[PDB]
Write an enzyme that holds these catalytic residues in place. Sequence first.
Site, PDB file in Angstrom:
ATOM      1  N   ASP A 149       0.862  -1.059   0.098  1.00  0.00           N
ATOM      2  CA  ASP A 149      -0.023   0.019  -0.112  1.00  0.00           C
ATOM      3  C   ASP A 149       0.867   1.159   0.051  1.00  0.00           C
ATOM      4  O   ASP A 149       0.618   2.067   0.866  1.00  0.00           O
ATOM      5  CB  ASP A 149      -1.023  -0.117   1.055  1.00  0.00           C
ATOM      6  CG  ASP A 149      -2.179   0.918   1.204  1.00  0.00           C
ATOM      7  OD1 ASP A 149      -2.243   1.467   0.095  1.00  0.00           O
ATOM      8  OD2 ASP A 149      -2.837   1.347   2.081  1.00  0.00           O
ATOM      9  N   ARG A 153       0.355   9.054   0.538  1.00  0.00           N
ATOM     10  CA  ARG A 153      -0.137   9.511   2.083  1.00  0.00           C
ATOM     11  C   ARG A 153       0.411   8.445   3.193  1.00  0.00           C
ATOM     12  O   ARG A 153       0.381   8.940   4.303  1.00  0.00           O
ATOM     13  CB  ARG A 153      -1.600   9.020   2.135  1.00  0.00           C
ATOM     14  CG  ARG A 153      -1.916   7.585   1.492  1.00  0.00           C
ATOM     15  CD  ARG A 153      -3.483   7.440   1.539  1.00  0.00           C
ATOM     16  NE  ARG A 153      -3.918   6.124   0.941  1.00  0.00           N
ATOM     17  CZ  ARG A 153      -3.816   4.795   1.218  1.00  0.00           C
ATOM     18  NH1 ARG A 153      -3.365   4.872   2.603  1.00  0.00           N
ATOM     19  NH2 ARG A 153      -4.201   3.807   0.553  1.00  0.00           N
ATOM     20  N   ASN A 154       0.961   7.329   2.840  1.00  0.00           N
ATOM     21  CA  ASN A 154       1.661   6.580   3.620  1.00  0.00           C
ATOM     22  C   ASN A 154       3.206   6.836   3.880  1.00  0.00           C
ATOM     23  O   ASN A 154       3.971   5.913   4.302  1.00  0.00           O
ATOM     24  CB  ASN A 154       1.379   5.057   3.379  1.00  0.00           C
ATOM     25  CG  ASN A 154       0.019   4.421   3.392  1.00  0.00           C
ATOM     26  OD1 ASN A 154      -0.757   5.193   4.207  1.00  0.00           O
ATOM     27  ND2 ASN A 154      -0.081   3.384   2.861  1.00  0.00           N
ATOM     28  N   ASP A 167       3.050   2.635   7.310  1.00  0.00           N
ATOM     29  CA  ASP A 167       1.889   1.500   7.120  1.00  0.00           C
ATOM     30  C   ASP A 167       2.351   0.281   6.123  1.00  0.00           C
ATOM     31  O   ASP A 167       1.297  -0.125   5.584  1.00  0.00           O
ATOM     32  CB  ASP A 167       0.793   2.524   6.529  1.00  0.00           C
ATOM     33  CG  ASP A 167       0.429   3.294   7.568  1.00  0.00           C
ATOM     34  OD1 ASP A 167       0.544   3.110   8.939  1.00  0.00           O
ATOM     35  OD2 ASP A 167      -0.461   4.349   7.206  1.00  0.00           O
TER      36      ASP A 167
HETATM   37  N1  LIG Z   1       3.232   7.992  13.525  1.00  0.00           N
HETATM   38  C1  LIG Z   1       2.542   9.091  12.874  1.00  0.00           C
HETATM   39  N2  LIG Z   1       2.485  10.093  13.154  1.00  0.00           N
HETATM   40  C2  LIG Z   1       1.742  11.356  12.894  1.00  0.00           C
HETATM   41  N3  LIG Z   1       0.740  10.959  12.300  1.00  0.00           N
HETATM   42  C3  LIG Z   1       0.551   9.740  11.693  1.00  0.00           C
HETATM   43  C4  LIG Z   1       1.302   8.734  12.111  1.00  0.00           C
HETATM   44  N4  LIG Z   1       0.861   7.495  11.534  1.00  0.00           N
HETATM   45  C5  LIG Z   1      -0.469   7.886  10.797  1.00  0.00           C
HETATM   46  N5  LIG Z   1      -0.660   9.262  11.136  1.00  0.00           N
HETATM   47  C6  LIG Z   1      -1.826  10.051  10.423  1.00  0.00           C
HETATM   48  O1  LIG Z   1      -2.766   9.287  10.963  1.00  0.00           O
HETATM   49  C7  LIG Z   1      -3.939   9.413   9.974  1.00  0.00           C
HETATM   50  C8  LIG Z   1      -4.685   8.195   9.632  1.00  0.00           C
HETATM   51  O2  LIG Z   1      -3.650   7.293   9.024  1.00  0.00           O
HETATM   52  P1  LIG Z   1      -4.289   6.296   8.069  1.00  0.00           P
HETATM   53  O3  LIG Z   1      -5.496   5.559   8.634  1.00  0.00           O
HETATM   54  O4  LIG Z   1      -3.183   5.414   7.552  1.00  0.00           O
HETATM   55  O5  LIG Z   1      -4.676   7.175   6.925  1.00  0.00           O
HETATM   56  P2  LIG Z   1      -4.528   7.003   5.314  1.00  0.00           P
HETATM   57  O6  LIG Z   1      -5.600   6.748   4.604  1.00  0.00           O
HETATM   58  O7  LIG Z   1      -3.445   6.075   5.107  1.00  0.00           O
HETATM   59  N6  LIG Z   1      -3.963   8.829   4.880  1.00  0.00           N
HETATM   60  P3  LIG Z   1      -5.043  10.225   4.610  1.00  0.00           P
HETATM   61  O8  LIG Z   1      -4.654  10.494   3.105  1.00  0.00           O
HETATM   62  O9  LIG Z   1      -4.617  11.094   5.534  1.00  0.00           O
HETATM   63  O10 LIG Z   1      -6.461   9.440   4.843  1.00  0.00           O
HETATM   64  C9  LIG Z   1      -3.330  10.185   8.696  1.00  0.00           C
HETATM   65  O11 LIG Z   1      -3.663  11.423   8.536  1.00  0.00           O
HETATM   66  C10 LIG Z   1      -1.984   9.864   9.032  1.00  0.00           C
HETATM   67  O12 LIG Z   1      -1.014  10.813   8.432  1.00  0.00           O
HETATM   68 MG   LIG Z   2      -1.099   5.930   5.901  1.00  0.00          MG
END
Ligand SMILES: Nc1ncnc2c1ncn2[C@@H]1O[C@H](COP(=O)(O)OP(=O)(O)NP(=O)(O)O)[C@@H](O)[C@H]1O
Ligand SMILES: [Mg+2]
Length: 298
Positions: A149, A153-154, A167
């Site tokens: 994935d 965003r990741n 991720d």
């Molecule tokens: N270690 C971290 N520190 C700060 N923020 C984080 C971390 N890990 C995840 N996030 C944030 O947590 C939110 C949810 O992560 P995730 O469920 O993986 O959403 P995503 O669909 O992968 N990315 P997005 O485009 O923001 O929806 C996102 O806004 C990430 O940027």
């Molecule tokens: Mg992510």
Amino acid sequence: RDLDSALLAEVKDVLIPHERVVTHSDRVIGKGHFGVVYHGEYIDQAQNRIQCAIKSLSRITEMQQVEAFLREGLLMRGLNHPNVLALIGIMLPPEGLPHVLLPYMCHGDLLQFIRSPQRNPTVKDLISFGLQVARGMEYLAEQKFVHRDLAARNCMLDESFTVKVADFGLARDILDREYYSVQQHRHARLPVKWTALESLQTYRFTTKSDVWSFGVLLWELLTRGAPPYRHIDPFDLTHFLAQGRRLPQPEYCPDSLYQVMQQCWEADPAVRPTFRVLVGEVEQIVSALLGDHYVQLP
Ligand SMILES: Nc1ncnc2c1ncn2[C@@H]1O[C@H](COP(=O)(O)OP(=O)(O)NP(=O)(O)O)[C@@H](O)[C@H]1O
Ligand SMILES: [Mg+2]
């Protein structure tokens, strides 16, 4: 929970005991398919309190899935690279979902960084970010890890704007089929649009599936976060790519870097380059670049 004691002994080095951890349920960072990420805190071995992020894993119901994850998590605990996000560890609360503790990344994800109108990224700035992603991924691949994935965003950004790939270790072969399913009306940003043609036909992923995804990520960087295959009716996507059509060269994207992107989207997974070669090729481009210019938003 009541898990196989032998397992918990086997996986000791990954595990943070629940009583060494505080998850701030009122401080949600964000929500997504695999779980919710909160602000959190945990206690060190050196006995200090460290603030971080904590992700409740909502897709691990089965005990087979828990123990499988515990063992991957042990391997992930060993991963040490500047462009890979560290796994602090995993916590099992006496009743509930497994939680993953991650270092807090204070500048967020690469997509939102590049989409920000407060920012004026140059072509070379964006290629550099891509270069840092290819090192993260080269390491992962050397360590026999498949992301599944990879996308903008990741990829998180730390205090000093070092990109951390992240991720990985969430999505799995076959089991997460539905995550890569087609035809969902609001489809502009589904993982289907980043994933290799042959993975869409099996839900089996390899490093060469990651090389496809990287190419798509590199396109994002240079469109500053445009949705890929935006106007492609979602049911027509596999057929479209089988026809040999691909994402169009971004306005300010060099021909050589587009040639790289094209190599990543080769339909023969074996013909795609390795991340070792990609670090080399992309690095060469950054230095070869004649002049530089700002990139605009879509
Ligand atoms: N270690 C971290 N520190 C700060 N923020 C984080 C971390 N890990 C995840 N996030 C944030 O947590 C939110 C949810 O992560 P995730 O469920 O993986 O959403 P995503 O669909 O992968 N990315 P997005 O485009 O923001 O929806 C996102 O806004 C990430 O940027
Ligand atoms: Mg992510």
